[PDB]
Amino acid sequence: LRVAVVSSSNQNRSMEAHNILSKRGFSVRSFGTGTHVKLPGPAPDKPNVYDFKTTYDQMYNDLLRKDKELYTQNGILHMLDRNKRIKPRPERFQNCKDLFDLILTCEERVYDQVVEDLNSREQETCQPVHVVNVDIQDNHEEATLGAFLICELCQCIQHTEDMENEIDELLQEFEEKSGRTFLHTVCFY
Amino acid sequence: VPRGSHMTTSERVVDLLNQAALITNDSKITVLKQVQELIINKDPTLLDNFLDEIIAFQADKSIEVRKFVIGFIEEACKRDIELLLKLIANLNMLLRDENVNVVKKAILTMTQLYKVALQWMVKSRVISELQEACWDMVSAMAGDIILLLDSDNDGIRTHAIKFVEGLIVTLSPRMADSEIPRRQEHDISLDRIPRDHPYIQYNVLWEEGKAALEQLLKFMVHPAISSINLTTALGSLANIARQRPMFMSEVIQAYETLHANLPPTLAKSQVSSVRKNLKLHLLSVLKHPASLEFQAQITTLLVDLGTPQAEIARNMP
């Protein structure tokens, strides 16, 4: 099962999922659909802002020299180190050309950006890819709980005979067990 | 490849085919893809010679092996469409595989081959009794895929919708306002079929294209239609509308019908997913220059779905 997990900045929700899925033997890539990268700052209204070209290591260093103590206490330096250990930089979904069975998005806005983008690429093959959303709030604890939920869903899917025929029924069971809604659509390669 | 430059391609092919026989897992596909590349692209004069050796893998127990064989049939027929004479039977038998992933791959391959076969028929100087029968086979297989819209399997229905979409577009003419994918510039379409062709009848194909569209419009108002099949059909209609704007009328009508009669069996999140796709496709049709004639209706639907005015404007000319 080839999965892509997509958030806004490719920093937290998708990287937490990337990490769990990867360690659990899934084939997984992660992306963000945001215009730029956003990281928490010293007040909820003053985030740090970066270009998608910027490396996790460059963000780490920039934050280290800004306020070492703040970005230690808020888990961000450790997050960026964790991310550096998976890959060198955040990846923008709109710039990749890879094939997945399943694309999971971490909030509705990201799901709209994934759908808008895939729906605007010319289909060559008409092979479907399933796109599923779950709303996960952008903080560490939610990213972690959401990553486990996503891992559980992926595992269910690994286990079904016929993914396309059973996936809706599975999502409905997940809605019921989690109380969280799961939007679901297909796009075409 | 060590000493490759000293080998003939045919020798290399036989070596690789025997190698593939030695291997008892999916990595044999890597070998068989090297064979494919050599007898389709490096030296296609070897394609006929080795065809049976590749096609023999259609009986392999591996799902991925049989999918590989379907892809090979696809490439072999694009290289040399006359091979359909001896491969249409195999492709139709693979449409009928016990495994749904093999079935689905066969549907996508027919979606590529039907139009290649029809071009072949249109271009053919002379036409044999065998080539007529081969066209009967392709055409009956197209009919079988249209019937897969009534499959009990959701993934097969989704693939059948995509085949049906391609068929409607092939069997209707390009027009001044057709928005044509770059890849497809030289694909055959109705307007390219001479009215006086000795075998392929323009009028018959026109009627099949319309009947294919009717089947799809009927499917869409089926009470049990699944969330994925309905979103697939919505996107198929938007593609059709943009490539063949004489059907834009039919598409807007379907969209209005769906908007006023949402299929009651859709769960809450399914209704939302569909509604979000309805809005996406309406905006997509609005951007198309031929949507001039439908703009008030499209705008009304979009306002009903909660689209802000500023977003509607952003999608106007």
User: Rounded CA gap, B49 and B52, in Å?
Assistant: 8
User: Rounded CA gap, A65 and B70, in Å?
Assistant: 58
The 3-state DSSP class for residue A60 equals helix
- Picking from B100, B231, B284, the nearest residue to A186 by CB comes out as B231
C-alpha pair distances (Å), B59 with each of A94, B53, B101: 40, 12, 15
How many structural domains comprise chain B? 1
The verdict on a CB contact (< 8 Å) between A171 and B183 is: no
The verdict on a CB contact (< 8 Å) between A126 and B181 is: no
The verdict on a CB contact (< 8 Å) between B153 and A181 is: no
The verdict on a CB contact (< 8 Å) between B154 and A164 is: yes
A129 touches chain B (CB under 8 A): no
Which candidate, A78, A66, A130, places its Cα nearest to that of A104?
A130
Strands (E), A33-178: 37-39, 48-50, 102-105, 128-133
Domains and CATH numbers, chain A: 1-34+91-189 (3.40.50.2300), 35-90 (6.10.140.550)
Q: Strand pairing of A102-105 and A2-7? A: parallel
DSSP notation for chain B: -TTGGGS-HHHHHHHHHHHHHH--STTHHHHHHHHHHIIIII-GGGHHHHHHHHHGGGG-S-HHHHHHHHHHHHHHHHH-GGGHHHHHHHHHHHHT-SSHHHHHHHHHHHHHHHHHHHHHHHH-SS--HHHHHHHHHHHHHHHHHHHGGG-S-HHHHHHHHHHHHHHHHHTS---TT----GGGTTS--GGGS-TT-SSS-HHHHHHHHHHHHHHHHHHHT-TT--HHHHHHHHHHHHHHHHH-GGGHHHHHHHHHHHHHS--TT--HHHHHHHHHHHHHHHHHHHHSGGGGGGHHHHHHHHHHTT--HHHHHTT--
Q: Can you tell me which residue has the tokens 């809605």?
A: A175
User: Rounded CA gap, B32 and A130, in Å?
Assistant: 29
Under a CB-based contact definition with an 8 Å cutoff, are residues A145 and A121 in contact?
no
Q: How far is A119 from chain B (nearest CA, A)?
A: 9
B180 touches chain A (CB under 8 A): no
Range of the domain at B137: 1-317
The 3-state DSSP class for residue A49 equals strand
Residue of A nearest to B183 (CA): A124
What CATH number is given to the structural domain containing B181? 1.25.10.10
Q: Report how this structure was experimentally obtained.
A: X-ray
The verdict on a CB contact (< 8 Å) between B181 and A181 is: no
Strands (E), A20-172: 27-32, 37-39, 48-50, 102-105, 128-133
Chain B CB contacts of A130 below 8 Å: 228
The verdict on a CB contact (< 8 Å) between B158 and A164 is: yes
Q: How far is B163 from chain A (nearest CA, A)?
A: 9
Give the residue from A103, A115, A126 with the most B CB atoms within 10 Å of its CB, the best one to mutate. A126
Q: What resolution in angstroms does the PDB record give?
A: 2.2
The 3-state DSSP class for residue A186 equals strand
C-alpha pair distances (Å), A118 with each of A115, A181, B165, B304: 5, 22, 18, 25
Chain A CB contacts of B155 below 8 Å: 128, 162-165
The verdict on a CB contact (< 8 Å) between B183 and A122 is: yes
Number of CB pairs, chain A paired with chain B, less than 8 A apart? 75
- Picking from B158, B182, B183, the nearest residue to A128 by CB comes out as B158
